[PDB]
Amino acid sequence: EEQLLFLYIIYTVGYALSFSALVIASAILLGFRHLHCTRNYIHLNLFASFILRALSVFIKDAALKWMYSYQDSLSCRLVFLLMQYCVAANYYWLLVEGVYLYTLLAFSVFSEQWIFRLYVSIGWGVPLLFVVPWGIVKYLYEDEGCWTRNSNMNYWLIIRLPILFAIGVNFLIFVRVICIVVSKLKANIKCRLAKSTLTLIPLLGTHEVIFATLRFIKLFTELSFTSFQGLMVAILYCFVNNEVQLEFRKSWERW
Amino acid sequence: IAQARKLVEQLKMEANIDRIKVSKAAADLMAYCEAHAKEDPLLTPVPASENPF
Amino acid sequence: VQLQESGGGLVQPGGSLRLSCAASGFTFSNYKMNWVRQAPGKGLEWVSDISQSGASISYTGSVKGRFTISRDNAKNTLYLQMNSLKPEDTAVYYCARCPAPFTRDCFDVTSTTYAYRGQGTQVTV
Amino acid sequence: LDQLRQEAEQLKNQIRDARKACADATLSQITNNIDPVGRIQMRTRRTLRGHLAKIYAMHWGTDSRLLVSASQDGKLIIWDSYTTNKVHAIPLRSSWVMTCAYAPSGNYVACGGLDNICSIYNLKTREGNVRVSRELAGHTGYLSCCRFLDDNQIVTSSGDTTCALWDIETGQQTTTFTGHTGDVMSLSLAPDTRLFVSGACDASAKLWDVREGMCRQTFTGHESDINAICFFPNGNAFATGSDDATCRLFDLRADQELMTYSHDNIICGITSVSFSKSGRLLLAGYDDFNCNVWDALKADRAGVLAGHDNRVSCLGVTDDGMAVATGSWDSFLKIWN
Amino acid sequence: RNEEKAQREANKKIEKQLQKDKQVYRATHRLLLLGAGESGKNTIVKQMRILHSGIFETKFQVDKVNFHMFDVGAQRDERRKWIQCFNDVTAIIFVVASSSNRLQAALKLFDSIWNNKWLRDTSVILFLNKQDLLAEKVLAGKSKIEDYFPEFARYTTPEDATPEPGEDPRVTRAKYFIRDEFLRISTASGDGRHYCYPHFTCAVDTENIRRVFNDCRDIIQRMHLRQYELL
């Protein structure tokens, strides 16, 4: 009970802090008009995905706050479905961010409006293509206990495979970017490489592949990092970003 | 030598020019600015109704 | 912008002579300065420049170790000290100035028709 | 040659003595009892977007409504500042446009740049689509300004140190002005269109007679190049800004500088100036992304039009004094009030 | 009210065109080609032109990528004003006459470009386009590089020197010495906002375009990475 209680406490703390940091960062990015660019649009989409994920998870457990004070009602299953969809959308938006960075260094140019429309479609729409089928199957063939309990793991394989594919692609992009960065630093060192590599973890979320009494510590690290990922991304790419800092400084001077 | 000669003529022409005390020019500028002061919308704010912006 | 050279004359090879450039009409300390000379049948050639306060110095390779550059921002002056002249250094010397203040670049000081360039004095060996 | 230079120095000394004799008092003393203008807290009221690259110059229309802008993406655009709607989008032959102009009657706009050629465009074509009407050649250096005397005469100034007058109908140089030893940057016609001035890259300003084609006066005092110039509304004064980080005001009859506008915090160079309708506010642009407001008769500052994210490279005031524009290498025009 | 529909109709048609233009503008790279008079600049320019007024524009494409190169002309030698227009170019090629005292003028010009503030973000490429002439001058012996360059007396070939087959040690020593003079200028105060890319070239080098292509790609990659705050 002690370890579980501490893990839950850290979990909630991390998720709430990520929610707060991400909402603040989204407000800041959408406030300044000068900063409007495709990159910032993708970042705002990622922030929205994280915020929706955090909102979905907190309420889901809060139901127990009421039930343990709906287990066969209609809306409980829908809530479970929504949580699944939010998780998938968050992971695929991380994938989209990685793909966009690689394209930027891929040395290729395409019609910006069409590319942005395609990316917006891929980030939010692709998840509809497995979550909805999973909900349909749970409704029609394995509807037991709000769908939370699973019997045929084959239907449980629907959700996991796309997420694993996204994680693999993110990891590959991370490897390529690190190779290029090392080449650039060599041609023109350890401290700078360490500084760069660490900053690239939360954006692509490679900690998942990194984590491929010791078991308790492993669970602690996994849950803590997953919870705090949102806050880390928000910090790194909004508050310590150069142009945002300069924007804040010049605004303050003007005010 | 040609460059000097044209410099010679230009200076001579410019030297023979009438001049007035700076006080008169300053007074004239002050008088103009005072006279047309009331008709500079930037100098004094304007009603929102008239302001096309 | 007024540049007034002085100190020329005649000297036998291997002798010494000093060039004293006087300037007025602008804040002396702010402007990077140069010495540039014109030998007969030759385009303008560069010699040596000195920073705002004398921190940095430079020379063209050929005159390395022979001449010397120095300025006195307190007295609105630029100086050049010569020692051990060679036969092939007869030329006129143009006390020069860089165009913009507070900057480090000195575009086109050796231009054919620069504006802030002195008339120069003759030094023959 | 030595005698010529010696007696020329004598002439210069005589001129300096004559000018010094006429300096009885300072401009500030005469206006020592003028009340301060006060804090001019102007703010943006519009914002015009569409330019890809930086903006070099713009010119107001004679009605205080239309204006034209010129940028280095190869585009002229005529806005309607009242509603911010585009009216025309004129492509250019040479993408390095360095100036533009608006005809008095509103029928033509002219532009030119490193190509050395000043082009004329027609806004009242029968077909309705603007097309080239006359290309003027004859300069041997980048063209840096141009203004219209009327629908049939355009005065141009170039970097080869010569200002010229053109007859648009034929294309010949009816007259050519010479006497500068450096690049000529900016000029402005008189209120009556009888005289115009131009300061060059030698820290000197010269007043010209359009009819006689010869220099009339010369002014000096600046330490470095000259980037902007403009006539005071009454036509009897003109203020100039230089790369020395200072602005100055002259008078065509005093034949000498009357006041300077300086501050220690400023270590950058001016790029454009302009007066207000009453000639009581001297606006100005700077390289540090700001535009200042100088109370002309007091030497002080009284307002800052901050907001630009890069250098300011143009400016102007409507003929009726209602609105003020600004342009910048950021590619965005702003309308203040 | 009909006029507003008439005007609002006009704006839409215009905006459709500018957005059409914006896409085309971003697919083209701009390159300014400086160079000393005796540098053979015109030869390299003709080399680009054949294989594919106050200013001359040359358009060529490599691997479906479009480069737009502008060579100045019919201008006065005072460059300190019309040079500001080129602050946004991708790079500023720079041909030099190594074998030529011309070289000192090239050094001063390169320094002036490097330290100028408006250009403090435009990386400069560097060519050395008289290698055969320098080789024959030094080999013939009647050049005495030491007199104009006293520091050349104690210079020795750098440890990393990679010479072409059949290259004399004296030739390599001189050639690599020439470059070092510029790199002293291009390393100090760089600040990492822009770089220099030295090369050893010949008047008839076919691949002169390939070098600039690769260096433009490298500049683009560095800019993008700096945008994400990796480098």
- Cβ of C113 within 8 Å of Cβ of D243? The answer is no
For D291, counting Cβ atoms within 10 Å of its Cβ (0-12 exposed, 13-18 middle, 19+ buried), the class is buried
By what technique were these coordinates determined? cryo-EM
Query: What is the rounded CA–CA span in Å between residue A3 and residue D86?
Result: 67
CB-based contact (8 Å) between A34 and chain D?
Answer: yes
Q: Which residue of D has its CA nearest to C115?
A: D202
DSSP letters, B1-53, are -HHHHHHHHHHHHHHS-----HHHHHHHHHHHHHHTGGG-TTTS---TTT---
CB-based contact (8 Å) between D179 and chain E?
Answer: no
Task: Say how many residues make up chain B.
Answer: 53
Which of D 35-54 lie inside 8 A of B, CB atoms? 37, 40, 42, 45-46
Mutate to test the interface with B, among D17, D26, D30, D206 (most CBs of B within 10 A): D30
Q: Where are the domains of chain D?
A: 1-336
Alpha-carbon distances, residue D155 vs A125, C78, D110, D146, D218 (angstroms): 61, 43, 11, 6, 19
Query: What is the rounded CA–CA span in Å between residue E7 and residue D82?
Result: 12
Contact E63, E213 (CB under 8 A): yes
CB within 8 Å of C100: residues ≥ 6 apart: D224, D225, D243, D269, E80
3-state secondary structure of C13: coil
Alpha-carbon distances, residue A144 vs A73, A87, A157, D55 (angstroms): 11, 22, 18, 67
CB within 8 Å of C88: residues ≥ 6 apart: none
* Phi/psi of residue A75, nearest 5 degrees: -75, -20
Q: Is residue E3 part of a domain?
A: no
CATH assignment, C2-125 = 2.60.40.10
Domain that holds residue E154: 28-228
Query: What is the rounded CA–CA span in Å between residue A101 and residue E198?
Result: 30
* Helix (H), strand (E), coil (C) string for A128-180: HHHHHHHHHHHHHCCCCHHHCCCCCHHHHHHHHHHHHHHHHHHHHHHHHHHHH
Here the tokens at position A198 are 């660490």
* Helix (H), strand (E), coil (C) string for chain D: CHHHHHHHHHHHHHHHHHHHHCCCCCHHHHCCCCCCCCCCCCCEEEEECCCCCCEEEEEECCCCCEEEEEECCCEEEEEECCCCEEEEEEECCCCCEEEEEECCCCCEEEEEECCCCEEEEECCCCCCCCCEEEEECCCCCCEEEEEEEECCEEEEEECCCCEEEEECCCCCEEEEECCCCCCEEEEEECCCCCEEEEEECCCEEEEEECCCCEEEEEEECCCCCEEEEEECCCCCEEEEEECCCCEEEEECCCCCCCEEECCCCCCCCEEEEEECCCCCEEEEEECCCCEEEEECCCCCEEEECCCCCCCEEEEEECCCCCCEEEEECCCCEEEEC
* Phi/psi of residue B41, nearest 5 degrees: -55, -35
Paired sense of beta strands E55-62 and E65-72, if any? antiparallel
Residue pairs spanning A and E at CB distance below 8 A: 33
Note whether A touches C: 3 CB pairs or more under 8 A.
no
- Cβ of E18 within 8 Å of Cβ of D50? The answer is yes
Nearest to B26 among D27, D234, D324 (CB): D27
CB-based contact (8 Å) between E149 and chain C?
Answer: yes
Neighbour subunits, D (≥3 Cβ pairs < 8 A) = A, B, C, E
Nearest to E184 by CA among E162, E210, E155, E211: E155
Here the tokens at position D20 are 């010094």
Q: Does the domain formed by D1-336 have CATH 3.40.190.80?
A: no
Name the one residue in this structure whose structure tokens are 């390529």: A176
Name every chain D residue with its beta carbon within 8 A of the beta carbon of A254.
306-307
Q: Number of folded domains in chain A?
A: 1
**From the CA of C57, how many Å to the nearest CA of chain D?**
24
Contact D197, D220 (CB under 8 A): no
Mutate to test the interface with E, among A109, A179, A198, A240 (most CBs of E within 10 A): A109
3-state secondary structure of E144: coil
3-state secondary structure of C66: coil
Nearest to E80 among C45, C64, C107 (CB): C107
* Phi/psi of residue D209, nearest 5 degrees: -100, 120
**From the CA of C112, how many Å to the nearest CA of chain E?**
8
3-state secondary structure of C65: coil
Contact D313, D57 (CB under 8 A): yes
- HSE of C25, CA atoms in CB hemisphere, 13 A: 14
Here the tokens at position C50 are 């000195």
Domain that holds residue A243: 1-255
Query: What is the rounded CA–CA span in Å between residue A146 and residue A70?
Result: 9
Q: Strand pairing partners for D220?
A: D204
Element (H, E) at C50: strand C45-50
DSSP state of A217: H
CB-based contact (8 Å) between D58 and chain B?
Answer: no
Query: Dihedral of the CA atoms A52, A56, A59, A61 (nearest 10)?
Result: -140
Greatest distance between any 2 Cα atoms in chain D? 66
Q: Strand pairing partners for E225?
A: none
Sheet strands side by side (includes D44-48): D44-48, D333-336, D324-328, D312-317
* Phi/psi of residue E162, nearest 5 degrees: -120, 100
Cα–Cα–Cα angle for E41, E47, E50, nearest 5°? 135
Cα–Cα–Cα angle for C122, C123, D4, nearest 5°? 10
**From the CA of E158, how many Å to the nearest CA of chain A?**
17
Query: What is the rounded CA–CA span in Å between residue E113 and residue C40?
Result: 29
Nearest to E53 among D75, D116, D182 (CB): D116
- Cβ of E75 within 8 Å of Cβ of D52? The answer is no
Sign of the Cα pseudo-torsion (D148, D150, D151, D155, in order): negative
Query: What is the rounded CA–CA span in Å between residue A142 and residue A136?
Result: 10
Query: What is the rounded CA–CA span in Å between residue C6 and residue C79?
Result: 10
Mutate to test the interface with D, among A32, A33, A35, A250 (most CBs of D within 10 A): A250
* Phi/psi of residue C60, nearest 5 degrees: -75, 145
Here the tokens at position D46 are 């519009």
Query: What is the rounded CA–CA span in Å between residue E226 and residue E231?
Result: 5
**From the CA of C108, how many Å to the nearest CA of chain E?**
6
**From the CA of D130, how many Å to the nearest CA of chain E?**
14
Q: Strand pairing partners for E207?
A: none
Mutate to test the interface with D, among E20, E21, E56, E83 (most CBs of D within 10 A): E21
Mutate to test the interface with B, among D322, D326, D335, D336 (most CBs of B within 10 A): D322
- Cβ of D307 within 8 Å of Cβ of A34? The answer is no
Here the tokens at position A197 are 């590599």
Cα–Cα–Cα angle for E45, C43, D143, nearest 5°? 55
**From the CA of E78, how many Å to the nearest CA of chain D?**
9
Query: What is the rounded CA–CA span in Å between residue A99 and residue A204?
Result: 10
Question: Which one-letter amino acid corresponds to residue D92?
Answer: L
CB-based contact (8 Å) between D276 and chain B?
Answer: yes
Contact C14, E72 (CB under 8 A): no
Query: What is the rounded CA–CA span in Å between residue A18 and residue C2?
Result: 67
First to last CA, chain C: 31
Q: Is residue E23 part of a domain?
A: no
Q: Number of folded domains in chain B?
A: 1
* Helix (H), strand (E), coil (C) string for A20-77: HHHHHHHHHHHHCCCCCCHHHHHHHHHHHHHHHHHHHHHHHHHHHHHHCCCCCCHHHH
Here the tokens at position D94 are 């040479």
Element (H, E) at A109: none
Query: What is the rounded CA–CA span in Å between residue A22 and residue A228?
Result: 11
Query: What is the rounded CA–CA span in Å between residue D214 and residue D212?
Result: 6
Q: Where are the domains of chain C?
A: 2-125
CATH number assigned to the domain comprising residue E111: 3.40.50.300
Question: Which one-letter amino acid corresponds to residue D168?
Answer: I
Helix residue ranges, H only, E39-130: 41-51, 102-115
**From the CA of A32, how many Å to the nearest CA of chain E?**
18
**From the CA of C54, how many Å to the nearest CA of chain D?**
21
CATH number assigned to the domain comprising residue B32: 4.10.260.10
